[PDB]
Design a protein around this nucleic acid. Structure first.
Lengths: 63, 63
DNA sequence: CTCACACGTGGGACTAG
DNA sequence: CTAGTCCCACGTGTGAG
């Protein structure tokens, strides 16, 4: 039963979710992801602010 | 000594990272995605994407 | 303690024999 | 049926502070 690999595999898989996610804040220019309620530089929070630098960025109507 | 049952501490906390991936999905452009090689619609595979957009949105107009 | 975390695990679409 | 892929998510033993 390939769960034997599914391990070696679904690890590589769950890993991808990291390399990249890592590589988001890795260069979230918006360094405020450095300064706030941030209870963890690893997933969630970083991603909360990760959507943020974009959230600033999606400003499309300069007066 | 909830060193087993503390359980919920994971997902009840994980939930954020879920939607973090999700708001990361709200301000990302489907219309963009055509550029990106389809990976599969996953809670990992698209963290890949938010980078793409972001890495991009930065140098907007530069020529 | 409270956090955050990476492992296995059963797994349920989907596909190729 | 049989198993090989996908990627989802829970339940945890652990380090860290």
């Amino acid at each position: 039963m390939k769960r034997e690999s599914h391990k070696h595999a679904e690890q590589a898989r769950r890993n991808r979710l990291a390399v990249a996610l890592h590589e988001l804040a890795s260069l979230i220019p918006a360094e405020w992801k450095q300064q706030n309620v941030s209870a963890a530089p690893s997933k969630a929070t970083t991603v909360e602010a990760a959507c943020r630098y974009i959230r600033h960025l999606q400003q499309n109507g300069s007066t």
